[PDB]
């Protein structure tokens, strides 16, 4: 036991030295001649009404027109954002729903929560009705996130310190990813869809290879729980939001932290993170009831989106890059442009 | 046009359904049940009831005087609680059960209550405090095998208040113990001195019948305080 612990300490020291032998320059030094983006101002176009209680998640479709939302009163609504017409309103079986997703082919949606179950809903039915088609069971803790890869494979993460890859047609887990110590809070998929990353409420993040099922790299640097994570557009970086009031930019090839976004005034944690189409803006949602817009290459705040009444819990940006949707605990969605 | 009319008709049907659903959602009362394994909260659930493997939550429904209560219990989770406890920031009340006749794990209950009271997202929610298993407490005090002062030294000099009105038939030692234990919790309750939310304590046994009425009355008082605060009168 003691020898194994000593070997672990030696390996950690060697890894630390290998990382420290590479920081020949900082991101600020390389980017000291970049012209700032100036002030950014955005206005609400549409306000979408109809939920009865607070909202936990949303997701944009691939057509950049239809979106899905999930509220804690037990409903899942599909909206058209150009005319604010409700296309669908599906009632759930368990009302403590925490996540939602939208299939890239536009045929299915999914949801889950404290019931330890992932439910799949089929939209394109000849009878014109939405009905449950699959319930995936086998996790021993609440569900945090889920993301389709295609019409047949789905990857989820639970509050039992595990992630899993499921075959919907058969109904059995095909691989399980283990190694985290705390509850897994968020995951994000790569553009090529052959890797993902995960942040899991113990102040660490991991990079997972889908096919093989093992862990490639582990990233540390925060000092409390991690709440959100997402990929940079080219698939070679990712941003992390935490509960110590700090966002951080991490790289995969240099194997260490690149940048910290924080201010001496903020004393509240970040609940959502998302990028922009060219990656020049990083948008964040806070417990202060308002969202912040940061320049991602010079670490200077550049805008505020400040129209909500309660905690902001979800944030999304379309695939063409025209609008930004925010959802909060007062049961209202808003679209900015 | 010729297609948009159907879309608006669809949206109108959906809105009608949503209104009919809001009508019934705004009328039920939601309660969250909390406790430990050595308590008897399952007995409370069973007493109020007649009135899938790996399941993460259970629901129990009842009604009193044509008012409908939904009580939620947590099933198969892990030890930690600082993440799924935030989903319950809008319930009417939290029902907290404590086993009061062990003397060894009572500090754990105090610490749990003190951590719930001060959480940022649970500062408006009231608590109904049940102190279960009182006959065992009476027998244990009358036996004399274990002494309370071995865990709370300040019990060595606590005198029952003169203005207190005891229940008939009590041996004064039992009343001393009961009053001391209840005071240990009300002291944490009022140390904030805010007025947003209140703690209502009771003493209950293993065979009992009036617990549903107690919950009903305390919920009535809670609703009254909300109604006063809503009209800007306070």
């Amino acid at each position, epitope marked *: 036991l003691d020898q194994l612990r000593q070997e672990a300490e030696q390996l950690k020291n060697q890894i630390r030295d290998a990382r420290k032998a590479c920081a020949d320059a900082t991101l600020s030094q390389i980017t000291n001649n970049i012209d700032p983006v100036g002030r950014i101002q955005m206005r609400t176009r549409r306000t979408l009404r109809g939920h009865l209680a607070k909202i936990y998640a949303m997701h944009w479709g691939t057509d950049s027109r239809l979106l899905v939302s999930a509220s804690q009163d037990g409903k899942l609504i599909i909206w058209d954002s150009y005319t604010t017409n409700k296309v669908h309103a599906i009632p759930l079986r368990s009302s403590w729903v925490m996540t939602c997703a939208y299939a890239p082919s536009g045929n299915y949606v999914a949801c889950g929560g404290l019931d330890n179950i992932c439910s799949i809903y089929n939209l394109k039915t000849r009878e014109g009705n939405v009905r449950v088609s699959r319930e995936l069971a086998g996790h021993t803790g609440y569900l945090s996130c889920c993301r389709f890869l295609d019409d047949n494979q789905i990857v989820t993460s639970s509050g039992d310190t595990t992630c899993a890859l499921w075959d919907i047609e058969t109904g059995q887990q095909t691989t399980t990813f283990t190694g985290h*110590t*705390g509850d897994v809070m968020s995951l994000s998929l790569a553009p090529d869809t052959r890797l993902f990353v995960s942040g899991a409420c*113990d*102040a660490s993040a991991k990079l997972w290879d889908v096919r093989e099922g093992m862990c490639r790299q582990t990233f*540390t*640097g925060h*000092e*409390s*729980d991690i709440n959100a994570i997402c990929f940079f557009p080219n698939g070679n970086a990712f941003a992390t939001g935490s*509960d*110590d009031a700090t966002c951080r930019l991490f790289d995969l090839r240099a194997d260490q932290e690149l940048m910290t976004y924080s201010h001496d005034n903020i*004393i509240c*944690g970040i609940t959502s993170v998302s990028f922009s189409k060219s990656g020049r803006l990083l948008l964040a949602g806070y417990d202060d009831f308002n969202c912040n817009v940061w320049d991602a290459l010079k670490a200077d705040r550049a805008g505020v989106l400040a129209g909500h009444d309660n905690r902001v819990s979800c944030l999304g940006v379309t695939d063409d890059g025209m609008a930004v949707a925010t959802g909060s605990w007062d049961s209202f969605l808003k679209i900015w442009n | 046009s010729a297609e948009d009319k159907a879309a608006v008709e669809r949206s109108k049907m959906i809105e009608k359904q949503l209104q009919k659903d809001k009508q019934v959602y705004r009328r039920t009362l939601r309660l969250l049940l909390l406790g430990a394994d050595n308590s008897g909260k399952s007995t409370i659930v069973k007493q109020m009831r007649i009135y899938v493997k790996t399941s993460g939550i259970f629901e129990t429904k009842f009604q009193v005087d044509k008012v409908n209560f939904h009580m939620f219990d947590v099933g198969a989770q*892990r*030890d*930690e*609680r*600082r993440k799924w406890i935030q989903c319950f920031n809008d319930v009417t009340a939290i029902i907290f059960v404590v086993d009061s006749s062990d003397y060894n794990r009572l*500090q*754990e209950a105090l*610490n749990d209550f*003190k*951590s719930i009271w*001060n*959480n*940022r997202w649970l500062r408006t929610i009231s608590v109904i405090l049940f102190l279960n298993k009182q006959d065992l407490l009476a027998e244990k005090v009358l036996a004399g095998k274990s002494k309370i002062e071995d*865990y*709370f*030294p*300040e019990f060595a000099r606590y005198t029952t208040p003169e203005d207190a009105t005891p229940e008939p038939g009590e041996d004064p030692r039992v009343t001393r113990a009961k009053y001391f234990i209840r005071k240990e919790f009300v002291d944490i309750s009022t140390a904030s001195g805010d007025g947003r939310h209140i703690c209502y304590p009771h003493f209950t046994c293993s065979v009992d019948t009036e617990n549903a009425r107690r919950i009903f009355n305390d919920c009535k008082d809670i609703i009254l305080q909300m109604n006063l605060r809503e009209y800007n009168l306070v």
Partner: nanobody
Amino acid sequence: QVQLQESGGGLVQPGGSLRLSCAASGFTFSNYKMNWVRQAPGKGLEWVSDISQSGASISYTGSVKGRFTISRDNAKNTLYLQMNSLKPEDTAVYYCARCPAPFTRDCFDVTSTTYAYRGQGTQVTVSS
């Protein structure tokens, strides 16, 4: 990389005294509330004492009142416990614990399921 390392402990004859010192790294020491917990042979984890962000609020359990004291050096990043007049039932393993979040006045840090921000403990034995 949060790290909490303990030092002190050992064998003590009954009625003795000693000192436990814990050193912390990987976070801003002054924003967090701190605790001392212990595990006794053949039992679960137990809470012993706690101190707040400055030292103006201290709390103990009923079994160690008048015997153990706690202290906090924010400049030297260190948490101290002083033990006087030990008993044979004070033999256990001792861990120092940190709150999950800053600027907050509550805790959820007694669990067994590998609480993340906790140390490896030291052994304190009292017998002769």
